[PDB]
Design a protein around this ligand. Structure first.
Ligand SMILES: [Fe+3]
Ligand SMILES: [Fe+3]
Length: 285
């Protein structure tokens, strides 16, 4: 099982997990806000706007050339994802405050070229080239668009090469790792939510397998049964947060990431770098 397409309910599940994690959480109000956005993502995915279909010849060529069928840079430039942004904005009539109201308005008012420039920046990790307040909304629109496209492939089309650091469906970096019930490890795409098998004893950026280290931080919840452990690598000074479903089967790559930002800081002070984007949260900015 090299590949896992996400559930058609991925966004509802993500929202529910966020609500579950938010209870008694220092950033619970924020996490509950993101849950609302994830609920919107599910409603959109269940009721797509009119979309230009994927060119079946272009799919054929990209597959013939060993490229991801939903290669993000190409598709983000073509603009066929744009009706998702329109739908998300129209489906968000009740923002929490004036600043989010202002973020949505900038997105509503921006024309195609502007929206595309921001989307290219976000998907390439150039956070200084879009406004931080727009990130969650633009990111959420792009995630729905790419998951919709993913769920409509065309099985065989997604590459199943055996030690890819980048998503075989869209070419984006993972947001997190997922260790599924000896016990197989998957990378989880930051964009399309494709999960793909990646050898368990290897750094997710540089491909060194040399003795990596595994780091968990207390939660009341003991460390031998930890759901979160960061994989750390001294050769590239990278870390990747990974969730172990053996200890909580409801663990979600996006929701458990947003609920464990304390570990990121513990690592970012220990001299470790994160190269796994979360498209709903700027660093940022
Ligand atoms: Fe992907
Ligand atoms: Fe490394």
């Amino acid at each position: 099982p090299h590949l896992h397409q996400p559930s058609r309910d991925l966004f509802a599940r993500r929202g529910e997990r966020l609500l579950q994690l938010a209870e008694g959480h220092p950033m619970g109000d924020y996490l509950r806000l993101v849950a609302g956005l994830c609920r919107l993502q599910q409603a959109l995915l269940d009721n797509p706007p009119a979309l230009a279909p994927l060119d079946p010849e272009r799919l054929r060529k990209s597959r013939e050339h060993g490229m991801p069928p939903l290669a993000y840079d190409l598709l983000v430039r073509e603009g066929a994802w744009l009706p998702w942004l329109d739908a998300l904005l129209a489906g968000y009539p009740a923002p929490a405050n004036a600043a989010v109201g202002a973020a949505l308005e900038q997105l509503r008012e921006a024309e195609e070229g502007q929206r595309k420039a921001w989307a290219i920046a976000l998907l390439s990790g150039q956070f200084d080239l879009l406004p931080a307040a727009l990130v969650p909304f633009l990111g959420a629109a792009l995630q729905v668009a790419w998951s919709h496209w993913l769920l409509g492939l065309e099985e065989g089309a997604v590459v199943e090469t055996e030690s890819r650091t980048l998503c075989p469906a869209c070419g984006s970096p993972p947001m997190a790792g997922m260790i599924r019930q000896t016990g197989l490890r998957y990378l989880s795409c930051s964009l399309c939510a494709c999960e793909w098998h990646y050898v368990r004893i290897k750094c997710s950026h540089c491909e060194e397998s040399k003795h990596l280290a595994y780091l968990s931080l207390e939660h009341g919840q003991p460390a031998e049964k930890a759901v979160l452990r960061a994989e750390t690598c001294p050769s590239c000074q990278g870390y990747l947060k990974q969730f172990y479903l053996e200890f909580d089967r409801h663990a979600d790559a996006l929701a458990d990431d947003l609920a464990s930002l304390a570990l990121d800081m513990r690592l970012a002070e220990d001299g470790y770098l994160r190269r796994s984007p979360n498209l709903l949260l700027a660093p940022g900015g």
